Motif scaffolding. Structure first.
Motif, PDB file in Angstrom:
ATOM      1  N   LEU A   1       0.781  -0.934  -0.146  1.00 51.36           N
ATOM      2  CA  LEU A   1       0.022   0.087   0.080  1.00 51.36           C
ATOM      3  C   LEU A   1       0.905   1.317   0.009  1.00 51.36           C
ATOM      4  CD1 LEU A   1      -3.198   0.832   1.777  1.00 51.36           C
ATOM      5  CD2 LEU A   1      -1.370   2.414   1.832  1.00 51.36           C
TER       6      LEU A   1
ATOM      7  N   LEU B   1      -0.784  11.844   1.561  1.00 50.38           N
ATOM      8  CA  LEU B   1      -1.855  12.835   1.759  1.00 50.38           C
ATOM      9  C   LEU B   1      -0.907  14.374   1.337  1.00 50.38           C
ATOM     10  CD1 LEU B   1      -3.217  11.995   5.197  1.00 50.38           C
ATOM     11  CD2 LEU B   1      -4.607  12.581   3.435  1.00 50.38           C
TER      12      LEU B   1
ATOM     13  N   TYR C   1      -7.256  11.326   6.275  1.00 47.64           N
ATOM     14  CA  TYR C   1      -6.969  10.024   5.802  1.00 47.64           C
ATOM     15  C   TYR C   1      -7.933   8.981   5.035  1.00 47.64           C
ATOM     16  CZ  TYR C   1      -2.825  10.457   8.923  1.00 47.64           C
ATOM     17  OH  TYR C   1      -1.697  11.142   9.346  1.00 47.64           O
TER      18      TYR C   1
ATOM     19  N   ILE D   1      -4.394   6.638  -2.549  1.00 47.30           N
ATOM     20  CA  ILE D   1      -3.873   5.219  -2.199  1.00 47.30           C
ATOM     21  C   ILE D   1      -3.842   4.522  -3.603  1.00 47.30           C
ATOM     22  CG2 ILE D   1      -4.638   2.987  -1.017  1.00 47.30           C
ATOM     23  CD1 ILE D   1      -6.132   5.033   0.742  1.00 47.30           C
TER      24      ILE D   1
ATOM     25  N   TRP E   1     -10.383  -5.011   3.373  1.00 45.95           N
ATOM     26  CA  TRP E   1      -9.511  -4.878   4.149  1.00 45.95           C
ATOM     27  C   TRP E   1      -9.398  -3.328   4.328  1.00 45.95           C
ATOM     28  CZ3 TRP E   1      -8.061  -4.569   8.911  1.00 45.95           C
ATOM     29  CH2 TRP E   1      -6.960  -4.011   9.321  1.00 45.95           C
TER      30      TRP E   1
ATOM     31  N   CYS F   1       4.629   7.534  11.412  1.00 44.78           N
ATOM     32  CA  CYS F   1       5.024   8.306  10.006  1.00 44.78           C
ATOM     33  C   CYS F   1       5.025   9.810  10.444  1.00 44.78           C
ATOM     34  CB  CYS F   1       4.237   8.022   8.982  1.00 44.78           C
ATOM     35  SG  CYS F   1       4.472   6.337   8.320  1.00 44.78           S
TER      36      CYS F   1
ATOM     37  N   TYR G   1       2.282  -2.805  18.850  1.00 51.15           N
ATOM     38  CA  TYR G   1       0.701  -3.004  18.926  1.00 51.15           C
ATOM     39  C   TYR G   1       0.390  -2.942  20.611  1.00 51.15           C
ATOM     40  CZ  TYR G   1       0.950  -4.372  14.292  1.00 51.15           C
ATOM     41  OH  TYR G   1       1.484  -4.325  13.076  1.00 51.15           O
TER      42      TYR G   1
ATOM     43  N   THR H   1       6.747  -0.494   7.330  1.00 49.04           N
ATOM     44  CA  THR H   1       6.141   0.564   6.844  1.00 49.04           C
ATOM     45  C   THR H   1       7.268   1.701   6.578  1.00 49.04           C
ATOM     46  OG1 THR H   1       3.945   0.308   7.761  1.00 49.04           O
ATOM     47  CG2 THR H   1       4.386   2.438   7.274  1.00 49.04           C
TER      48      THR H   1
ATOM     49  N   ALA I   1       2.757   6.946   3.454  1.00 50.64           N
ATOM     50  CA  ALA I   1       3.611   5.726   3.825  1.00 50.64           C
ATOM     51  C   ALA I   1       3.718   4.880   2.610  1.00 50.64           C
ATOM     52  CB  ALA I   1       2.963   4.973   4.903  1.00 50.64           C
TER      53      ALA I   1
ATOM     54  N   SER J   1       4.099   0.645   2.623  1.00 50.93           N
ATOM     55  CA  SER J   1       3.824  -0.312   3.502  1.00 50.93           C
ATOM     56  C   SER J   1       3.942  -1.708   2.513  1.00 50.93           C
ATOM     57  CB  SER J   1       2.410  -0.312   4.021  1.00 50.93           C
ATOM     58  OG  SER J   1       2.285   0.452   5.195  1.00 50.93           O
TER      59      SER J   1
HETATM   60  O1  LIG Z   1      -0.375  -0.827   5.753  1.00 49.33           O
HETATM   61  C1  LIG Z   1      -0.478  -0.321   7.149  1.00 49.33           C
HETATM   62  N1  LIG Z   1      -0.985   0.833   7.560  1.00 49.33           N
HETATM   63  C2  LIG Z   1      -0.956   2.080   6.623  1.00 49.33           C
HETATM   64  C3  LIG Z   1      -2.451   2.095   5.863  1.00 49.33           C
HETATM   65  C4  LIG Z   1      -3.006   1.034   5.440  1.00 49.33           C
HETATM   66  C5  LIG Z   1      -4.609   1.205   5.052  1.00 49.33           C
HETATM   67 BR1  LIG Z   1      -5.708  -0.239   4.669  1.00 49.33          BR
HETATM   68  C6  LIG Z   1      -5.022   2.487   4.983  1.00 49.33           C
HETATM   69  C7  LIG Z   1      -4.222   3.570   5.092  1.00 49.33           C
HETATM   70 BR2  LIG Z   1      -5.168   5.400   5.117  1.00 49.33          BR
HETATM   71  C8  LIG Z   1      -2.902   3.368   5.487  1.00 49.33           C
HETATM   72  O2  LIG Z   1      -2.470   4.695   6.118  1.00 49.33           O
HETATM   73  C9  LIG Z   1      -1.564   5.465   5.185  1.00 49.33           C
HETATM   74  O3  LIG Z   1      -1.441   4.795   4.007  1.00 49.33           O
HETATM   75  C10 LIG Z   1      -0.685   6.556   5.633  1.00 49.33           C
HETATM   76  C11 LIG Z   1       0.072   6.093   6.984  1.00 49.33           C
HETATM   77  C12 LIG Z   1       0.716   7.297   7.314  1.00 49.33           C
HETATM   78  C13 LIG Z   1       0.650   8.542   6.965  1.00 49.33           C
HETATM   79  C14 LIG Z   1      -0.266   8.877   5.713  1.00 49.33           C
HETATM   80  C15 LIG Z   1      -1.090   7.719   5.013  1.00 49.33           C
HETATM   81  N2  LIG Z   1      -1.751   7.951   4.066  1.00 49.33           N
HETATM   82  O4  LIG Z   1      -1.454   9.097   3.091  1.00 49.33           O
HETATM   83  O5  LIG Z   1      -2.785   7.239   3.814  1.00 49.33           O
HETATM   84  C16 LIG Z   1      -0.453  -1.666   8.028  1.00 49.33           C
HETATM   85  C17 LIG Z   1       0.525  -1.007   8.937  1.00 49.33           C
HETATM   86  C18 LIG Z   1       0.906  -2.330   9.734  1.00 49.33           C
HETATM   87  C19 LIG Z   1       0.194  -3.526   9.915  1.00 49.33           C
HETATM   88  C20 LIG Z   1      -0.828  -3.597   8.946  1.00 49.33           C
HETATM   89  C21 LIG Z   1      -1.300  -2.776   8.027  1.00 49.33           C
HETATM   90  N3  LIG Z   1      -2.100  -3.085   7.244  1.00 49.33           N
HETATM   91  O6  LIG Z   1      -2.925  -1.965   7.035  1.00 49.33           O
HETATM   92  O7  LIG Z   1      -2.325  -4.108   6.987  1.00 49.33           O
END
Ligand SMILES: O=C(NCc1cc(Br)cc(Br)c1OC(=O)c1ccccc1[N+](=O)[O-])c1ccccc1[N+](=O)[O-]
Ligand SMILES: O=C(NCc1cc(Br)cc(Br)c1OC(=O)c1ccccc1[N+](=O)[O-])c1ccccc1[N+](=O)[O-]
Lengths: 166, 166
Positions: free
Chosen positions: B34, B38, B45, B50, B58, B77, B91, B113, B125, B127
Motif C-alpha cells: 500500500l 496526503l 486519511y 492510495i 481490508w 510516520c 501494538y 512501513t 507511507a 507499506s
Molecule cells: O499498511 C498499514 N497501514 C497504512 C494504511 C493502511 C490502510 Br488499509 C489505509 C491507510 Br489510509 C493506511 O495509512 C496510510 O497509508 C498512511 C500512513 C501514514 C501517513 C499517511 C498515510 N496516508 O497518506 O494514507 C499497516 C501497517 C501495519 C500493519 C498492517 C497494516 N495494514 O494496513 O495491513
C-alpha cells in the motif's frame, strides 16, 4: 550503519555528533561532508544548522556570496527527495559556473547531495564529496555505496533534527 | 530500480503506475503493498491517495473503523523518516491489538512501513507485507532487502506525489 545511528543518538553535543557523522562518511570513503538543516518554512540559509568539515573559508564565502540562491542543489532539494550528483550538466547559469569554479578551488569537485525532508517539515541536505582521479572513478565509487548512503541520510536526518531543534 | 522509476515516470495513469510499483515490490519479494499519500497539511486519511493490492475488503474496513487513528504506523510516520517493522511490540493499546488481529486475518501480518515525507510537504507511507512461514523468516528476508527498499520508497514518493497532486 545502525551502530553509527545509535552512537549519534548517544552523543552529547554538536561536536561529538559531528565527529561521529564525519567518521561514518570517511569510513564509507567520502572525504568532506556538509549536513545542513532548516526548520519548517524557513529560507534563512545563512542561519541553518550546519555540521561537517567543509573548509571554513569556503563556508564563509558561500554565505557572503549568497550562493544559496545559485547552488543548483539547493533548488533541487526544495523539489525532490532524490539525490543530485555533482555533474557538469547541473551548472547552467553564469553564476552557477562561477560557483562550480569556486567550489572546485575548495577541493569540492566530485560528489552528491541527498535532500532531507523531515517528519516535522525540516528542510535540509546531506552533501558528500569524494576524492578521485576523474569523474568516472568518482561515479563508480558513488554508485557502489549509494544504498548505504541512502539509508545514512535518513538516519542522519532523524537524529540531527533532534539535535538541531531541541 | 532506476529503470523502474523511469517506467513509473513514463507511465500513463494510476492503473499503469500501480502495476509497475506492485511488480517492483513483488520482484523484490513482497506480495502485498500500500502506497498512501496526503497533501501538505491534510489529516484526511479517509481521502488519501492510495495505490496497491491490499485486499479491498481490508481497505474498506480500515476506513470504516477509522483505523488511521489506531494503526501505530500512522503515528510513527508523523514523527519519523525511519522504517517501522510490524513487530508485536508496536501494538500497545487495546484498539491496536484488535488492529493487529484484523490485519493478520487479511493476510497482513509480517511487514514494514516506510514513512514518506515529500519535498512539498506530502505525508505518506509505503507499506509492504511479506508472505512468510513465520516472523523470524520474514525478518531475515526484510533485513536482506532493506537497502533496496529504502531507495525504492523515495523513488515511489518522488514519482507518486506527481501522479497524486501535480
Ligand atoms: O499498511 C498499514 N497501514 C497504512 C494504511 C493502511 C490502510 Br488499509 C489505509 C491507510 Br489510509 C493506511 O495509512 C496510510 O497509508 C498512511 C500512513 C501514514 C501517513 C499517511 C498515510 N496516508 O497518506 O494514507 C499497516 C501497517 C501495519 C500493519 C498492517 C497494516 N495494514 O494496513 O495491513
Ligand atoms: O554542499 C553544497 N551545497 C550545500 C551547501 C553548502 C554550503 Br558551503 C552551505 C550551505 Br547553507 C549549503 O546548503 C545547505 O546545506 C542546504 C541545502 C538545501 C536545503 C537546505 C540546506 N540547509 O539546511 O542550509 C555543494 C553542492 C554542490 C557542489 C558543491 C557544493 N559545495 O558547497 O561545495
Amino acid at each position: 550503519l545502525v551502530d553509527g545511528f545509535l552512537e549519534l543518538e548517544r552523543s552529547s553535543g554538536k561536536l561529538e555528533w559531528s565527529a561521529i557523522l564525519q567518521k561514518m562518511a570517511s569510513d564509507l570513503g567520502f572525504s568532506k561532508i556538509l549536513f545542513g538543516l532548516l526548520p519548517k518554512d524557513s529560507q534563512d540559509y545563512e542561519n541553518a544548522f550546519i555540521v561537517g568539515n567543509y573548509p571554513a573559508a569556503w563556508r564563509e564565502h558561500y554565505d557572503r556570496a549568497g550562493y544559496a540562491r545559485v547552488d543548483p542543489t539547493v533548488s533541487h532539494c526544495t523539489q525532490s527527495v532524490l539525490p543530485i550528483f555533482w555533474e557538469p550538466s547541473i551548472y547552467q547559469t553564469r553564476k552557477q559556473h562561477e560557483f562550480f569554479e569556486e567550489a572546485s578551488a575548495a577541493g569540492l569537485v566530485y560528489g552528491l547531495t541527498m535532500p532531507l525532508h523531515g517528519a516535522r517539515g525540516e528542510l535540509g541536505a546531506l552533501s558528500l564529496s569524494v576524492e578521485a582521479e576523474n569523474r568516472a572513478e568518482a561515479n563508480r565509487f558513488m554508485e557502489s555505496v549509494l544504498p548505504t548512503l541512502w539509508m545514512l541520510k535518513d538516519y542522519a536526518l532523524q537524529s540531527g533534527a533532534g539535535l538541531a531543534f531541541e
